[PDB]
Amino acid sequence: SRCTHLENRDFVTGTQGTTRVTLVLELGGCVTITAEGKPSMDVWLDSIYQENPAKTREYCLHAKLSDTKVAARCPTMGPATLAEEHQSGTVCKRDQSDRGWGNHCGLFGKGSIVTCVKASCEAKKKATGHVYDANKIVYTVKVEPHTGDYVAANETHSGRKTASFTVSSEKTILTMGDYGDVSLLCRVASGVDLAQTVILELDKTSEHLPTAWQVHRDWFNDLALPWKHEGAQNWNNAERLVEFGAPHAVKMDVYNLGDHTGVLLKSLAGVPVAHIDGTKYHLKSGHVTCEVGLEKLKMKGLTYTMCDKTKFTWKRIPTDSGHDTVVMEVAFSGTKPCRIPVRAVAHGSPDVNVAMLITPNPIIENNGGGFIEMQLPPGDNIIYVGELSHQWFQKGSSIGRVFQKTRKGIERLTVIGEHAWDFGSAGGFLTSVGKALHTVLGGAFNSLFGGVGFLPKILVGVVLAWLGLNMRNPTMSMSFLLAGGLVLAMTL
Amino acid sequence: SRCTHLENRDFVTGTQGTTRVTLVLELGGCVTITAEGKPSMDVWLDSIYQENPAKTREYCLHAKLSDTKVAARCPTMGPATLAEEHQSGTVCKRDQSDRGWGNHCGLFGKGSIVTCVKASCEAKKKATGHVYDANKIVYTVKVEPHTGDYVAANETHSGRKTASFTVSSEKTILTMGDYGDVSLLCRVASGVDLAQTVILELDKTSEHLPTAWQVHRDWFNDLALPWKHEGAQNWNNAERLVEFGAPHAVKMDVYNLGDHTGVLLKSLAGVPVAHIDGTKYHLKSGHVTCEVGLEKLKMKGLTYTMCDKTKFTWKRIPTDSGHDTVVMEVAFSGTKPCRIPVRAVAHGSPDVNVAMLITPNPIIENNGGGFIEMQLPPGDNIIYVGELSHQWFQKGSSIGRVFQKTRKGIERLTVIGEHAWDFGSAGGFLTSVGKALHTVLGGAFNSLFGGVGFLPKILVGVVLAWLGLNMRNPTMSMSFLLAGGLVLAMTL
Amino acid sequence: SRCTHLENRDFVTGTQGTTRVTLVLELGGCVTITAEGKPSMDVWLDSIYQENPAKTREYCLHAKLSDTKVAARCPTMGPATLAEEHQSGTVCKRDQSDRGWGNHCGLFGKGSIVTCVKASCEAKKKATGHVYDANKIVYTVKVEPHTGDYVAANETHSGRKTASFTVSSEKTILTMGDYGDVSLLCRVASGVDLAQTVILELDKTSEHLPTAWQVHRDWFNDLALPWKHEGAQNWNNAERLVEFGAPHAVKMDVYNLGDHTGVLLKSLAGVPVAHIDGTKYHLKSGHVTCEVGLEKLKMKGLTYTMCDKTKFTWKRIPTDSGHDTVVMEVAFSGTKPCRIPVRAVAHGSPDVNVAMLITPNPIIENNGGGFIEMQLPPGDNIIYVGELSHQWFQKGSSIGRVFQKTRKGIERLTVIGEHAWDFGSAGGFLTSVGKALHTVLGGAFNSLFGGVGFLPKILVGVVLAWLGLNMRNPTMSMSFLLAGGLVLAMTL
Amino acid sequence: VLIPSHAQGELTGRGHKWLEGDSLRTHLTRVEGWVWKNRLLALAMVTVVWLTLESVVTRVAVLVVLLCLAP
Amino acid sequence: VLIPSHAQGELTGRGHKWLEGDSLRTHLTRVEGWVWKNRLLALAMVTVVWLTLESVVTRVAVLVVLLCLAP
Amino acid sequence: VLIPSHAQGELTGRGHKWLEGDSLRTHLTRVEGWVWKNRLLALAMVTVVWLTLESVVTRVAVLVVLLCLAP
Ligand SMILES: *[C@@H]1O[C@H](CO)[C@@H](O)[C@H](O)[C@H]1NC(C)=O
Ligand SMILES: *[C@@H]1O[C@H](CO)[C@@H](O)[C@H](O)[C@H]1NC(C)=O
Ligand SMILES: *[C@@H]1O[C@H](CO)[C@@H](O)[C@H](O)[C@H]1NC(C)=O
């Protein structure tokens, strides 16, 4: 049961006869799939990476300046000119000095002056922007059967399976061993928007920094630095790291603005970190749409015998998972293998089972089993495992759980619904209408207010509310009602 | 395919039972004529030229002047005279000079003076006008089968067949090899309006200019430059390049206004270019109406077995053509010949072959085959070639494509004019009435408008709109109808 | 009497007790100073010139282009670049071309393309601007006494005197033999504006053109052509004679817009010509104010005997001059020197002389004298020289001469502008008021609508009239008469 | 691209002038030649103004404006 | 002397065209430069037209007409 | 994290220590860019405020103030 390790776990449920289930998988999240008569699976998107991306630009972070030269002219002797003005990799400026008898000219007045320096980029002071190729990125999905064995985060479950989806991938069959077989399919076209992502890499071996960052393409293209394309010989806009002092007689001075790394890193704030693993460049934020096929899964040990009721013992006592589920582990000491006599009752002992087992048909195997995961109705309950028993009090009210489930839905709804409304296993008659409305609403609310940001959005919403107070006639008030909906959407 | 090479191809199509389809083969464009149960063809017009078109008149752009001679007589004596006034091919002027005992006359006053110069054109500084002969103009039209072999623009497909059309030439039958015989008629009488058209040469074989321009008969006949007919020995109005100085004592200067060529080249701005290829004078704009006789083309290889699904490999993966088609190439290592098992499956309908192939019955043969082009509906699809596959997301939108087709139609009607009305087919009422009204209205409008120019269009529109606002009676509404009609038509 | 050789003679007249006359000498004019009891003087500004003015700019009139090169990149391979983009004297352009599998790229889309040519000015096709220096320009004033021996314009008078003026100069004393001394003071700072003037020259060797033109500084500075200062090796804005055709797939064509000289020569059409005499750069328009101290002029020959009336004969019979003035020459065969008895007696009125002699105290000498100039009353006259007589008829009319003289005053006001008040000025309060009014009006009208030119000034004047045709209040009704004055100021 | 002229009245003086007469009246020629092309429209345009501007005097100003705008 | 611009006159369609866009643009650059040098007088005449009102569209019509009539 | 801009203190007005005084005017490219990026919304605000307000100066000054408050 991997996904006990992880906040942002989701549950999905299939009816009897449910054969194929749509999901949206995302990094830092997991789906526990359950269905009637079928073993449960934990499914998650492990990693989004590409080997050897292409690259877009290099930016310079610290200029090296050298070979300052100056030329000047008396006030009527026309423009001063330097031979270096046309050499590649130089920064120049032209200006007017003041001249007179005191500078060995004939005339008092203004006289032309020009200055140029060689400009280069300091060793290991470049930023490189890498970009993805839609045909080569790999979407790695992993699946684990709920075998009822527990393993830590620094252990590997014996039955973990992996598929590596790509544009060439078609559809994958994963042999789960005794649990049968799962069909799995994922649409890379539905993945991250590879167009708008740039992987900003700084030069190597910085110990106390991220290895790379994931940044917006237009922001990266708007950096205020000298730049060149891959393999180009010289830096464009090299003047951006240089300033020229005011001219003074025949003399003019050049000031290096120094290392701009600090203003970059201070500008890289609120920005998701990325990762690099040798040649593999990984994202850390993204999602994919997949289509899990429960057709051929089956359950181990439905013919196994019932265990001895007397021989159980708690190894891990019932405790709260923080998902409103109870997790536990029993040792067993009889002859094996056998089915674990799990049941639970509400207090007053009506002898009606209220255990929602997430673990299918719990079994003690010849060398494994005994972990159990349950959901229970609110209030006072008694859990039983054979004769072994434990009083449990379940915290939240039913209306509280309903609200919390809606809050989880809303929490995912911004990220997933902006990608796709249909997380909820194709409630299609409702879901398609909701998707259409949300699509056109997002179209409006993004074409307007696009890039405005939450605070300026809200401020303009308040301006529109004041216009509401200024609406002379009912139709104008309807236009305010539209602005009300806008300002609500932006405040939410 | 050729038409892949061009940003401007039209997918004319015909149902089963369709024959003798009608095209209007705009130069600088291509037609992919696809017919159910028949081989697809690419058809286009490759050249419009005439060999050695006759010439109208010549201008000179830089005068050579020589033998300046002057005579003058005292004020009471009489008029000054030169024989160089009668010896034709000179430029001359008579004027009056102040004279007196300052200049050895007997009496003060104004006395007659005459000046003459010989004039001729500078070497290779002529310009020349040529005019097409409606019974010697030649058209050429090329057809190429969709064999499923790709061929770059610097290579020649083995099925590229050329027809040459002269108005004396009846229906032409071209044997497309195994696919059978296509036939054409391309009656030259639908060509460009040769009466409007003059070709302007500049006599030099300049290394950095277009070799000729195409210009309207009026503008070329209006030029304010000295001119002659071919083989006439001397220039008329040569004075247009010669400006006399003001008289002074017994003397007048003659000043030469120098080379006009930069003026002419700048005044040409806006004009269509042409080309000269030895003796052949090619236009670079036009069209012709072709009947295309498809009735004898036949499919190739409907009786071959399928290929083995296993052995296909992507030589070139599916990629967007920019024409909203998917273009791809496979290579196959099995025995030959065999039929390619192409399919495309929509996400919504896993059992439906949605692939609308442009290529007919795609075949592998001992030296060719395996290039494929298809069209797909917007959204998410998986292309297959037997076992080989590729996820394709068709980026367009149905309404967007229809709107783009309306834009194409508007463009065609603008550039072609009335002939556009009978593109594709006779089209019954809508086409014939549209042609009739468009011809009548466009003829009357061009009769009023011809030469008025852009800013005068805007001026007249604004004037008519202002009058429509100002004036009283109901007929002014019709004037506004004219005002809007002109304004939008001219602004579109 | 040099001034007889010109059309535009002027007369200036002094009573007894005339001292320092003020003149405005004008280039191409000539002033006859006359005074009671003194010899008359011709005075004129002979020439204005400077040796080797400083070159302000060169402009190029015909670019040579060579070494065309091109580089291009497939749609994602970033900017194409050339080493030529940085060098001196290269013109380059960057653009995009449509590329795809038709030209061996992998992607359909817009490739990057760049092209460069060397651009250099062809041979002699340069225009050079020169600027005068107030410290070095020399104004040459000449003076000639009315000694009464005639000479043609083709021959040099025996007593012509030259003064050269510069900032180094002072009251200059010219000794004219027995006619005494004359004092010239001329204000170099009162001459032409040396900032507003530029001499433009082309190839001086051009057989049928003037050597130079006296253009205005702002026009020459706003010329569009490629330009550089003297000695600079590389043309700024060299692209302005070059243009690049639309990108084909992997090519851009480059075109030379040809010899601009005809455009420049046409644009000159407003301009007064100038002149170059080896090193001496001469102007052909301008004026200087001068003060001519008459006080030491001396009458020659008042002690001589009267000539014998018997012995005159005509060397040149009387004639009009077009200055409403009669000129003649007599021979003599008595002993000499002597004083010529010249008189004129109107008709039928024998005792009233009417000979207003302009050549004073006429004398005949060994190889000298004998030429006489006088002005006469309109109508019949008899001219006598001793016993020699001629029945001159003086055409014209009494009021006609007054009208002609006052019209010349308007011509003077038109061509001089402000300074016309100085001409003939012996100081007077009314003249000072006139100069004040003219200076304020000229300052307003030169600032308001300065450089607007006559047709746009007509436009603005009539617009200002229209804006006053029928108006709400008289409070700005002056505007219509100001417009009338503007029209009058426009008219001339 | 283009070289403008400059006003005839700027420097003046009595010297010989290059193309002295060509600065002004020549500009009328393009208008007359324009009329000789436009004529059907031109008379129509005139009559359009003439019929609408029954306010007589402003006919002249309007048609002068139109003719001077006419290339 | 003068040669008229053909730029619109042939109305011809698809192909390759000499110097097309700068032909249209340079007229506007002429008006922009004339306005730029005028702006003192232009603003004065603007306020003079403000002394008048048949309509604001008349005001802008007269201003545009004047700026197009002059270079 | 923030460093306060010295122009708020500007301990002597005689100073010449950087370009930055002119650069502050270049920083109006923030407002102008916000204008250029949102012209249709600005024109919307224009069309709104030009119609909704009766006062004439506020129909400039308020929009100016809002565009200067926009970052
Ligand atoms: C996993 O971590 C625990 C605690 O850090 C440690 O006792 C155990 O040995 C680790 N096992 C592995 C395989 O790293
Ligand atoms: C066509 O162009 C390609 C450019 O890559 C070249 O390799 C090939 O040899 C050319 N073929 C012909 C026939 O020109
Ligand atoms: C002009 O003057 C020269 C000498 O200065 C003389 O020889 C010649 O005869 C003169 N010209 C005429 C036409 O007499």
Author numbering:
A (entry chain C), B (entry chain B), C (entry chain A): 1 to 492
D (entry chain E), E (entry chain D), F (entry chain F): 2 to 72
Per the authors:
Tick-borne encephalitis virus (Orthoflavivirus encephalitidis, TBEV) is an enveloped single-stranded (+)RNA virus belonging to the Orthoflavivirus genus. Orthoflavivirus particles have icosahedral symmetry with a diameter of about 50 nm and a genome of about 11 kb. The glycoprotein shell of the mature infectious virion consists of 180 copies of each of membrane-anchored E (496 amino acid residues) and M proteins (75 amino acid residues). Envelope proteins E orchestrate the early stages of viral infection, virus entry into the cell and receptor-mediated endocytosis.
Formaldehyde-inactivated TBEV strain Sofjin-Chumakov is produced in the industrial scale for the vaccine manufacturing process and represents its antigen. In this study, we performed the first cryo-EM structure determination for the particles from the clinically approved TBE vaccine preparation based on a Far-Eastern subtype strain. It demonstrated the reliability of virus samples inactivated by cross-linking agents for structure determination and surface epitope analysis, which is especially important for emerging viruses. ELISA studies with monoclonal antibodies supported the hypothesis of TBEV protein shell cross-linking upon inactivation with formaldehyde.
